[PDB]
Design a protein around this nucleic acid. Structure first.
Ligand code: MG
Ligand code: MG
Ligand code: MG
Ligand code: MG
Ligand code: MG
Ligand code: MG
Ligand code: MG
Ligand code: MG
Ligand code: MG
Ligand code: MG
Ligand code: MG
Ligand code: MG
Ligand code: MG
Ligand code: MG
Ligand code: MG
Ligand code: MG
Ligand code: MG
Ligand code: MG
Ligand code: MG
Ligand code: MG
Ligand code: MG
Ligand code: MG
Ligand code: MG
Ligand code: MG
Ligand code: MG
Ligand code: MG
Ligand code: MG
Ligand code: MG
Ligand code: MG
Ligand code: MG
Ligand code: MG
Ligand code: MG
Lengths: 98, 106, 51, 61, 192, 171, 199
RNA sequence: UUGAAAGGGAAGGGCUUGAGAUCAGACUUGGUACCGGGCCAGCAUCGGUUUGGAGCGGCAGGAUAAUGGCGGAGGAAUGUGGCACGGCUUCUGCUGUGUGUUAUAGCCUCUGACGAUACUGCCAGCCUAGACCGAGGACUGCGGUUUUUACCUAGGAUGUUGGCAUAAUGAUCUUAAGUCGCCCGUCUUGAAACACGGACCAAGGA
RNA sequence: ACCGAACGUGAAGUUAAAGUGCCGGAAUGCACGCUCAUCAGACACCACAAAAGGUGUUAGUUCAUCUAGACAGCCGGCCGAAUGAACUAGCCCUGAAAAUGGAUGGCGCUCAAGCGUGCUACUUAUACUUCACCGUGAUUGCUGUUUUGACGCUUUCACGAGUAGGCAGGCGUGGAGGUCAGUGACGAAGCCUU
């Protein structure tokens, strides 16, 4: 029941990991991920067994390659993904569209 | 990068009360920028943190939190009723709380 | 040990009233009525407008 | 609140056991509690009730 | 269900026909009433107190079905300052019986959660189902007495939305007591 | 109140002596049909030897406005009770519905004479077809040709408690 | 509706009790409020009527010892303060803290002379009173009942308004130059995109 | 005396939480890196209760709504154009007064065939947000789906993940804050009484 | 002592009477009017005010004069369009004078935060609804599996205010018969103690 998520790591520093759907705001911006292979990723992939596995680093790089290739198409999308979100003074989340 | 806030500012206003009797189990919370029950219904079920400082360190930290949640609206001007694990102490009337954006439903 | 409302629980509704299934299947709650387009008040019932 | 049409928490007003502590009368009440609970004969229910009665309610025959 | 629909269409047709033929169709007077006690248990004069007890309205927000005759109408007139009553629709009866329907079985309040409970207590009166019971109430039937007395008095909640500003004056004068006649359905929707 | 206009028709209960009693109609301004039938019997027992027990309600029908978007002037003839006596009066109202004119009348006698709903009998509500039928100046002043008027001193309602700019009342 | 660090209210043209109730709820709810120009506040009713009311207030004093009785403050800020304290549970610790959250002044002293003053529309006399009604200025009622510093405040207010006018003339000049520069940088690629975004 | 704490014309009390102090407890009498367990939480799904949405759809009734739009007939004025007189206009929303009835604006009444909407009901129609609770403890019942002597939402909460076990958690004591709280006993219709007994404590006391 | 509602220990929802400018939880809510008091008014019981008055203002009733130029004003004219009288009752004012300073509860409020009336929402009782737990009363079953507790176990439903008073079940104290082959100078009893 979790969501598989990538930064991408090169853009953000956020690797492939899981998040809970209730701790996430789903914006309206979308990236075409039909060209991204996420078949091998499942619950057992993130099993608990610092040093990070070479398999995990390789999968990060391989996924981020396709993600960046598709991200470059939309202008300012890489900068948007690389920038953090915060609530400014006078920002009302009940009135904002995400 | 000057701003890092991911919560909505709130205030602990009152307990649930009649003229003479107060009910500490329910707190009245004012969420900033909310002026109607329709606006306040966005925040139903959201978590609330009362963050305060204490004399003794616990695991190297002097910051403690009381957690709660928004349960329902109150009145017509956008106040909400909140339910904390431990009742907010009466001294916090007018103190600021944090209205978290989770559990998210956007 | 625990009363369940037949107006919320569909299983209890079918346990008590087996005909609820036929009512839903036949759409008795939104059944059209076939009738002619008539207006029987054009004459003396216009006594409502004035008298 | 309730508008009570009768007095609340009223005991039946009948003996449900002998006042006597005689163990052998208690054994007789045991036997006829079983018979009255299990035989459908009205005689056993009458005998079971009569074993509870006080001395003046069981005059000598 | 078929006879309910047929009766509704028949009444509609009769009204239209009377309208067409320069006449006036006068509806049949209601034969059933739902009576809700909206007054507390304190400071009641002896005669209306006895009347409310005989109607089994011994708490606030208690509801009962009454078949209208001269005797029962004169009963309800005595209890009028303490009750709100009216003419209940079929859906209102159904919702009451489904959600808050209880039977009096050996002087105990038993939920009507299975048709066997209804059959074991009203099977000698040809009531075999919750829908048989609802029909017997709605179309005031030959065994209305037994079916309505088997039904334990309905214990309603307070209205969601409140009463009018002041309950204890007749519905005609802006209060809540007395006969409201079709608005008992809205009130029951509020309280059930 | 918030009212509707009802046509209530009733009669005496038929007897073997009189098997078709006369049908009587009244126009009642009531919030609902329960008050409509109550007011009907209230006026019939002021006008006829009849009761609800010895009578029968024959028909209750809503009378809708004929032209609910045509501006009219209504004259209403009233009979109200004061603290001292009983008085007849005639007043005029501008509205698009007959019911809304009666609602304005009830507010107006509450405001100007402290006359409650129970103290008022509406004798008659008539739509004044001719401009010469208008007797009262407070409604005659809106029947002048090419009527214009501003609304000086507009007060704007604010959503916030504090405002960072000076208030204005132009309009 | 935002929580502010300090809300500075310009008291000119505000009805006394309506401003008092709004400020009372603000400071009870943890908001710091400063009210300036309390000499320009307003009370509905003619001046003579409000002066008679203040004399009724002055009548009340402890008979056995006048030093114990009510202390009738004559300054406009203290009249506003009395109105607020009557709307505050001032005999509790919470009410005392809430009252510590409040400041009231005649004129606009430093540092508030170079800060932003707001208004409260729900308590503005021009927006609340029917346009024909009579009202009182608290500065005149205060002078009529004993306040000694009316002319000092108006001398200092004229000096402050001269300095604030020099401020405003400079700010308007720099606003005119910045507007001319924004006009120069109009019809640029960024400006067209911001116009398509609504900015 | 020492130590701790509180203290603007009494103090003391109840409820609630904070702070500080004290006490307690599951890694159990745990079993063999692992199995599994305890407590506190997140999420998911369920069941019970309940409050909502600028919710969406279907059906019925009424004057088989009244209106409105379109067509026809009639009419009037707060009379449009035109016309005839005027005061200021290079007739520059020019304007006033008369006339009369659509003209270079329109309106009202009656009406003919359609088409909607409001309102009030019904749906054993659909979607959707939140809160509180989880009593019971092998099976047994009533139903439903039956692809089936099987499965289910159908006689009351489970699944999964994280953290913790020098502790998150709970209780009490002291104290602050919010709110409420008059001195008991007695005789009395009526006591906090400006009615009576009671300074305090121990032992005795009907 | 009035209104609401009557009370076991709790959770959630909803209300009653009363309210929603602040003190105070809930609207400076929507609406039609009225009222300005140099003693306004402000909510039943209830904590007061009358007769009589007012060209203050509002709305009514009935008469009368009116473009065949009403009343007012300059001498029939002159602009032109309404006018006069009596009466009725809303709010306001006069009538309305007491002793400590002081009470619509207070602040304060004037197209109200006042008065009359309508509407929407909202606030909250130990009351109502659902659920948990305690007890009382009733109630279902329990012996070839009753089985070392049947004065027991178990199913179900309803109910719970209380002086004087009655009854029931328990807690505690001195001494007595029996029993624990009970505790105890390796510390009984007593006393102090988050
Ligand atoms: Mg009870
Ligand atoms: Mg509500
Ligand atoms: Mg009420
Ligand atoms: Mg001192
Ligand atoms: Mg404590
Ligand atoms: Mg603590
Ligand atoms: Mg659920
Ligand atoms: Mg038409
Ligand atoms: Mg359990
Ligand atoms: Mg107190
Ligand atoms: Mg005595
Ligand atoms: Mg004596
Ligand atoms: Mg005496
Ligand atoms: Mg006493
Ligand atoms: Mg005394
Ligand atoms: Mg004496
Ligand atoms: Mg004596
Ligand atoms: Mg003494
Ligand atoms: Mg002693
Ligand atoms: Mg009464
Ligand atoms: Mg408030
Ligand atoms: Mg008088
Ligand atoms: Mg007058
Ligand atoms: Mg007076
Ligand atoms: Mg008060
Ligand atoms: Mg009002
Ligand atoms: Mg409650
Ligand atoms: Mg008792
Ligand atoms: Mg006693
Ligand atoms: Mg002795
Ligand atoms: Mg020994
Ligand atoms: Mg010892």
């Amino acid at each position: 029941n979790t969501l598989l998520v990538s930064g991408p790591f090169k853009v953000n520093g956020v690797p492939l990991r899981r998040v809970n759907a209730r701790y996430v705001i789903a914006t309206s911006t979308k990236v075409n991920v039909s060209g991204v292979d996420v078949s091998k990723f499942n619950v057992e992939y993130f099993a608990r067994e610092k040093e990070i596995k070479a398999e995990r680093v390789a999968d990060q790089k391989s996924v981020d390659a396709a993600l960046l290739s598709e991200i470059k198409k939309t202008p300012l999308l890489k900068q948007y993904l690389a920038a953090s979100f915060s609530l400014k003074n006078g920002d009302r989340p009940h009135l904002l569209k995400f | 990068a000057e701003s890092h806030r991911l919560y909505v500012k709130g205030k602990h206003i009152s307990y649930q009360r009649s003229k003479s009797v107060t009910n500490p189990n329910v707190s009245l919370i004012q969420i900033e920028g909310v002026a109607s029950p329709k606006d306040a219904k966005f925040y139903l079920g959201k978590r609330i943190a009362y963050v305060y400082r204490a004399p003794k360190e616990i695991r190297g930290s002097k910051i403690r939190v009381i957690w709660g949640k928004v349960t329902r609206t109150h009145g017509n001007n956008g106040l909400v009723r909140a339910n904390f694990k431990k009742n907010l102490p009466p001294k916090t009337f007018g103190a600021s709380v944090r209205i978290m954006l989770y559990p998210s439903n956007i | 040990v625990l009363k369940k409302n037949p107006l919320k629980n569909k299983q209890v509704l079918l346990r008590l009233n087996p005909y609820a299934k036929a009512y839903a299947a036949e759409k008795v709650g939104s059944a059209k009525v076939e009738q002619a387009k008539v207006k029987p008040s054009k004459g003396q019932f216009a006594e409502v407008l004035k008298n | 609140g309730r508008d009570h049409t009768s007095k609340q928490h009223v005991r039946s007003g009948h003996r449900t056991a002998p006042k006597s502590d005689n163990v052998y009368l208690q054994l007789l009440v045991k036997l006829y509690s079983f018979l009255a609970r299990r035989t459908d004969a009205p005689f056993n229910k009458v005998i079971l009730k009569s074993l509870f009665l006080s001395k003046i309610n069981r005059p000598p025959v | 269900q078929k006879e309910y629909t047929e009766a509704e269409r028949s009444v509609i047709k009769a009204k239209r026909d009377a309208k067409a033929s320069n006449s006036y169709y006068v509806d049949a007077q209601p034969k059933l009433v739902f009576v809700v006690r909206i007054k507390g248990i304190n400071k009641i004069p002896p005669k209306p107190r006895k009347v409310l007890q005989l109607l089994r309205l011994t708490q606030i927000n208690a509801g009962v079905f009454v078949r209208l005759t001269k005797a029962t109408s004169e009963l309800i007139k005595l209890a009028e300052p303490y009750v709100a009553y009216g003419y209940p629709s079929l859906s209102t009866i159904r919702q009451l019986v489904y959600k808050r329907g209880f039977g009096k079985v050996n002087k105990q309040r038993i939920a009507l959660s299975d048709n066997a409970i209804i059959e074991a207590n009203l099977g000698k009166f040809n009531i075999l189902s919750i829908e048989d019971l609802i029909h017997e109430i709605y179309t005031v039937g030959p065994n209305f007495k037994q079916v309505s007395n088997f039904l334990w008095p309905f214990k309603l909640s307070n209205p969601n939305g409140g009463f009018r500003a002041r309950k204890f004056q007749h519905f005609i004068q802006g209060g809540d007591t007395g006969n409201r006649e079709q608005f008992i359905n809205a009130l029951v929707k509020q309280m059930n | 109140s918030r009212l509707n206009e009802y046509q209530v028709i009733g009669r005496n209960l038929p007897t073997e002596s009189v098997p078709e009693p006369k049908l009587f109609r009244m126009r009642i301004f009531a919030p609902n049909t329960v008050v409509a039938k109550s007011r009907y019997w209230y006026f019939l027992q002021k006008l006829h030897k009849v009761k609800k027990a010895s009578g029968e309600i024959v028909s209750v029908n809503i009378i809708s406005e004929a032209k609910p978007t045509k501006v009219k002037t209504f004259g209403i003839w009233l009979r109200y009770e004061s603290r001292s006596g009983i008085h007849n009066m005639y007043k005029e109202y501008r509205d698009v519905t007959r019911v809304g004119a009666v609602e304005t009348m009830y507010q107006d006698l509450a405001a100007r004479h402290r006359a409650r709903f129970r103290s008022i009998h509406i004798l008659k509500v008539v739509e004044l077809e001719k401009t010469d039928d208008v007797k009262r100046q407070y409604v005659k002043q809106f029947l002048t040709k090419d009527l214009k008027f501003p609304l000086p001193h507009r007060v704007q309602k604010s959503k916030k408690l504090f405002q960072a700019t000076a208030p204005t009342t132009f309009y | 509706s935002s929580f502010e660090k300090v809300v500075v209210i310009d008291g000119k043209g505000h009805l006394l009790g309506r401003l008092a109730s709004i400020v009372s709820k603000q400071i009870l709810n943890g908001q710091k409020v400063v009210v300036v120009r309390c000499e320009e506040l307003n009370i509905s009713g003619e001046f003579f009527r409000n002066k008679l009311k203040y004399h009724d207030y002055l009548r009340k004093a402890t008979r056995y010892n006048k030093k114990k009785g009510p202390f009738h403050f004559r300054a406009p800020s203290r009249i506003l303060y009395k109105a607020i304290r009557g709307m505050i549970p001032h005999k509790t610790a919470r009410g005392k803290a809430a009252l510590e959250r409040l400041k009231v002044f005649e004129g606009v002293p430093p540092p508030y002379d170079k800060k932003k003053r707001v208004v409260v529309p729900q308590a503005l006399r021009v927006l609340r009173l029917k346009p024909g009604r009579k009202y009182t200025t608290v500065g005149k009622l205060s002078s009529a009942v004993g306040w000694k510093y009316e002319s000092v405040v108006e001398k200092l207010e004229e000096k402050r308004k001269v300095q604030s006018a020099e401020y405003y003339a400079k700010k308007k000049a720099l606003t005119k130059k910045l507007n001319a520069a924004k006009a120069s940088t109009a019809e640029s690629e960024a400006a067209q995109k911001l116009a398509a975004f609504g900015y």
